[PDB]
Symmetry: C3
Subunit: 231 residues, 3 copies
Amino acid sequence: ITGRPEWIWLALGTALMGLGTLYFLVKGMGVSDPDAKKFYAITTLVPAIAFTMYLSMLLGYGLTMVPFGGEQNPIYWARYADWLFTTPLLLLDLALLVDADQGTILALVGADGIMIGTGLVGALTKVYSYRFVWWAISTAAMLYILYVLFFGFTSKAESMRPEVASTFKVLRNVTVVLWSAYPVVWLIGSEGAGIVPLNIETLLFMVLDVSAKVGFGLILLRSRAIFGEAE
Amino acid sequence: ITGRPEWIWLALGTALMGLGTLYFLVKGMGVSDPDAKKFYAITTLVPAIAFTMYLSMLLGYGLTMVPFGGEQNPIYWARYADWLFTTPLLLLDLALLVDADQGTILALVGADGIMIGTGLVGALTKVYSYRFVWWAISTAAMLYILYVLFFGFTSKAESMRPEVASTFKVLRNVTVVLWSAYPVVWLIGSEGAGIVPLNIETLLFMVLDVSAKVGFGLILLRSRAIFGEAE
Amino acid sequence: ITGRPEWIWLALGTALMGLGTLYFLVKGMGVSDPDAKKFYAITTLVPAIAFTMYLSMLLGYGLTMVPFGGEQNPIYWARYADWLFTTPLLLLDLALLVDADQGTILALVGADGIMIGTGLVGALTKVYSYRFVWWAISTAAMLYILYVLFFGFTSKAESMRPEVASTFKVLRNVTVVLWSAYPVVWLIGSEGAGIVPLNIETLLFMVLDVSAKVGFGLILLRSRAIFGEAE
Ligand SMILES: CC(C)CCC[C@@H](C)CCC[C@@H](C)CCC[C@@H](C)CCOC[C@@H](CO)OCC[C@H](C)CCC[C@H](C)CCC[C@H](C)CCCC(C)C
Ligand SMILES: CC(C)CCC[C@@H](C)CCC[C@@H](C)CCC[C@@H](C)CCOC[C@@H](CO)OCC[C@H](C)CCC[C@H](C)CCC[C@H](C)CCCC(C)C
Ligand SMILES: CC(C)CCC[C@@H](C)CCC[C@@H](C)CCC[C@@H](C)CCOC[C@@H](CO)OCC[C@H](C)CCC[C@H](C)CCC[C@H](C)CCCC(C)C
Ligand SMILES: *C/C=C(C)/C=C/C=C(C)/C=C/C1=C(C)CCCC1(C)C
Ligand SMILES: *C/C=C(C)/C=C/C=C(C)/C=C/C1=C(C)CCCC1(C)C
Ligand SMILES: *C/C=C(C)/C=C/C=C(C)/C=C/C1=C(C)CCCC1(C)C
Ligand SMILES: CCCCCCCCCCCCCCC
Ligand SMILES: CCCCCCCCCCCCCCC
Ligand SMILES: CCCCCCCCCCCCCCC
Ligand SMILES: CCCCCCCCCCCCCC
Ligand SMILES: CCCCCCCCCCCCCC
Ligand SMILES: CCCCCCCCCCCCCC
Ligand SMILES: CCCCCCCCCCCCC
Ligand SMILES: CCCCCCCCCCCCC
Ligand SMILES: CCCCCCCCCCCCC
Ligand SMILES: CCCCCCCCCCC
Ligand SMILES: CCCCCCCCCCC
Ligand SMILES: CCCCCCCCCCC
Ligand SMILES: CCCCCCCCCCC
Ligand SMILES: CCCCCCCCCC
Ligand SMILES: CCCCCCCCCC
Ligand SMILES: CCCCCCCCCC
Ligand SMILES: CCCCCCCCC
Ligand SMILES: CCCCCCCCC
Ligand SMILES: CCCCCCCCC
Ligand SMILES: CCCCCCCC
Ligand SMILES: CCCCCCCC
Ligand SMILES: CCCCCCCC
Ligand SMILES: CCCCCCCC
Ligand SMILES: CCCCCCCC
Ligand SMILES: CCCCCCCC
Ligand SMILES: CCCCCCCC
Ligand SMILES: CCCCCCCC
Ligand SMILES: CCCCCCCC
């Protein structure tokens, strides 16, 4: 395990996701409100899935070698397995907060699936120049998602409770900033142009992942917006 | 890319799915009705997914070699990845049109999953005679789906709005004819008996795919059946 | 096929799932009640999926070799493909019976996904001692599911119809006993410590699978709890 310099960040990531999972699990024990239960379920599952995939990367299972540029390049494929399930759960948290219509939710989840799926294909593609074609398609799917979060959701939040409108606005802003960093790190890291070494890349993704999951969850689950308006 | 004679049909397929995706995306921009949004979301996602998988076939990612009959046989596995997601979306379009009950929808999607999954296993099976066992099981799942579309849905459409009944009937008929061709092409093509060469097989699937997705979508999204009855 | 001593149990399993599938399919033909249709759909799909995966194991497709302990160890990976889809369907049968809230259903299905997914990783892991780390995480996800079935569902059933409360209690008890045997068989069988040989392991899983699917389904589909209260 320690044979890879990036192991320290995989281990820290595993620990922080594990701790985040346990914290949300305990916190949600005292919850009976049916609406709050939905948000706790979604939000606890996110770091639990990430915990398993960080562990698989730490132990070496979630790593494969991909030939491109005349080299055997270490590619952590387990990231995409994580993201396939956790990024639509994160979007679902946002969509339920603002009572999004079903068509909009399906558009978001579908675009998200395309985003992660094409990122996976790009990560595993052996023809170097083609990796960036997949990156571009994935990034276009991301831009669609960000567009919807701003010009379909923000003006939906404003007709809702003030506490859900303010909580949505904060989580929207956190999401757009954090999620936009992922394609940049991929592009300059070992999957793309290879300018930033894998150990630093792994650190960067770990900070983004913990912030986008445990950070996000801490903000959401401390808000009164997750509860039905009750006396 | 041009090293494979079937590349021209993969390229045309990619282009037509891409163009179809953009057309539906633009067309649905001016839509606020919650019901119509569902149909636009579902129907736009279908060629978008197909676009990505056609591209993966064009670039060579979605192709593998399978030993059977003492030969290395080129198998485009990306078709099944496409179909796994797009065929239940197509069925969902039909089921929502007639306000199908939840049990019926689950039966359809489940049978569809079995249909595509067993087709994939058959496509990748190395014992030649066993490929046709999987083809038979998949075809039985197809026949179940077609049965339900006729003797569970058609008489559901007739108690609904005339515009939804007439639109459903047309899309049902398009679906049954087009979908029934797929097992025949598989059986006589490079996956099955090998009587029709891969380049012609690829052409045939491209015509079926564009018709079943973009053709289907053009009929559906031009109907007033996708809108709630409103003043 | 007969080259593997466990083939007889794979063949019997295939037959019993096939027969169970046909029986439930015929039985549900005379059903119009929308609630009952849901239970028939879910419950018929379960042995149908299991039939396909038992067949893939019989024909040899669903088997791979995994190096650990200095040996090539036969691992039937198709079990996890089965279980990935059938165990959440089984939980859905239980959850719908007691009209579980959406948050609880998502927690169950999510924990179940983690349970099966980590079992799959453990089954395919090449470092022997690490296989048991994945077994432990999977078992913890199982224990969560069993906890919810007892201390979240049982007291939900009691405020419902007596026929649904009594049917739920029986199916809950069947589920907890049968499902708890699976991690034990894995641990002592060819995936784990290797004390029980593969042919006996295969027998054990076949008895558990038929009981947990066809047995379970026979109890559920003969109950009046699956019908809406109607005059
Ligand atoms: C509604 C939304 C969910 C829409 C989803 C959007 C989605 C369509 C976007 C594209 C997804 C698609 C790229 C998934 C591809 C998975 C694939 C990378 C798995 C690895 O297999 C690739 C090659 C080795 O590189 O296998 C070597 C050759 C092997 C023989 C491969 C044969 C097995 C195939 C992988 C079977 C395909 C199954 C499905 C792709 C399962 C989807 C997995 C998940 C990653 C989407
Ligand atoms: C409700 C509905 C959805 C019901 C669904 C119906 C469904 C049950 C029908 C059968 C689906 C099942 C056949 C999927 C099999 C996928 C498999 C072909 C992927 C390729 O792996 C096959 C061999 C190489 O040929 O791998 C070589 C050996 C490797 C070590 C394989 C180990 C990895 C396994 C593939 C893990 C299994 C994961 C699940 C099958 C994911 C499902 C993928 C999708 C195609 C259904
Ligand atoms: C809401 C709930 C559903 C939550 C779900 C919980 C879930 C997160 C729990 C963990 C699931 C995760 C372990 C699935 C891993 C599948 C993996 C074993 C498939 C086989 O690939 C493993 C190695 C060979 O051993 O591939 C060799 C290297 C290859 C290059 C691998 C590259 C292809 C990757 C497999 C692509 C990943 C796609 C997704 C994992 C699809 C999920 C399949 C299913 C088994 C969950
Ligand atoms: C918890 C993990 C999260 C929130 C991950 C988010 C990841 C993305 C938004 C990834 C986006 C990518 C692209 C837009 C193109 C390049 C490849 C990706 C997959 C890194
Ligand atoms: C957009 C793509 C569509 C509508 C594809 C439909 C495909 C089928 C109905 C495929 C059916 C098959 C069988 C019935 C058995 C042989 C294998 C298949 C998968 C080709
Ligand atoms: C129809 C099949 C059923 C009901 C299978 C149930 C399987 C399980 C509950 C498996 C549990 C496992 C663990 C808890 C850890 C070890 C690995 C598994 C996957 C066997
Ligand atoms: C969105 C953030 C992307 C920028 C990442 C900056 C990383 C700077 C680290 C120094 C680069 C290491 C190069 C020498 C090894
Ligand atoms: C459902 C349509 C299946 C029939 C396809 C007919 C294809 C005819 C093309 C000629 C066959 C090529 C054989 C000589 C290369
Ligand atoms: C939950 C049941 C697990 C116990 C399984 C008992 C199997 C006993 C069979 C005898 C073991 C075979 C060892 C000699 C080959
Ligand atoms: C490819 C995996 C996509 C599914 C991820 C799980 C999250 C799905 C959330 C469903 C949202 C509800 C839509 C109506
Ligand atoms: C194996 C992939 C199956 C899922 C495909 C996505 C479409 C699912 C549509 C869900 C229909 C709603 C059922 C209640
Ligand atoms: C990884 C596969 C998980 C999906 C299995 C299919 C069963 C899903 C049942 C959905 C229950 C409804 C939740 C709201
Ligand atoms: C186009 C929608 C406006 C809100 C999205 C902001 C786009 C940020 C760009 C992210 C950088 C990705 C490379
Ligand atoms: C049995 C249901 C009647 C409607 C379905 C028509 C079946 C068409 C056969 C398709 C050919 C597949 C090989
Ligand atoms: C902790 C919840 C109480 C009900 C679950 C009973 C646990 C049975 C243990 C199963 C054995 C697995 C190794
Ligand atoms: C070796 C790099 C070749 C450049 C490929 C860039 C493709 C980016 C596509 C953006 C439309
Ligand atoms: C393919 C990228 C699309 C980003 C711009 C959004 C187009 C308008 C969509 C309106 C729902
Ligand atoms: C080499 C071909 C052997 C014939 C197999 C046909 C099987 C079809 C099954 C239909 C019930
Ligand atoms: C070779 C076996 C080494 C023992 C591993 C047991 C790990 C079990 C983890 C339970 C917390
Ligand atoms: C509760 C702490 C969980 C941390 C387990 C994984 C950390 C890796 C240590 C090497
Ligand atoms: C908008 C046109 C999209 C076409 C891109 C793929 C066509 C392949 C050209 C070689
Ligand atoms: C209807 C009987 C189904 C049995 C088919 C599979 C049994 C395997 C026989 C070798
Ligand atoms: C993006 C950083 C999130 C910070 C989380 C802090 C949570 C405290 C309530
Ligand atoms: C099956 C062929 C479909 C033809 C689509 C034409 C759409 C015009 C409205
Ligand atoms: C766990 C054993 C189940 C027994 C099923 C018998 C069904 C008869 C109604
Ligand atoms: C990591 C366990 C958290 C302890 C409880 C925190 C207050 C709910
Ligand atoms: C008003 C919300 C500001 C949140 C910005 C957080 C940036 C990481
Ligand atoms: C809305 C601001 C987006 C900031 C992008 C930051 C990418 C590192
Ligand atoms: C391909 C872009 C379509 C242009 C608009 C067509 C009329 C909505
Ligand atoms: C009355 C509907 C006829 C549609 C037939 C289309 C055949 C491709
Ligand atoms: C309902 C008519 C079906 C026609 C099947 C055509 C197969 C090529
Ligand atoms: C296996 C076929 C079952 C025959 C009908 C049983 C009574 C519904
Ligand atoms: C009162 C229900 C008892 C069911 C026990 C079944 C054990 C297999
Ligand atoms: C509730 C009793 C569980 C029995 C476990 C049996 C495991 C073989």
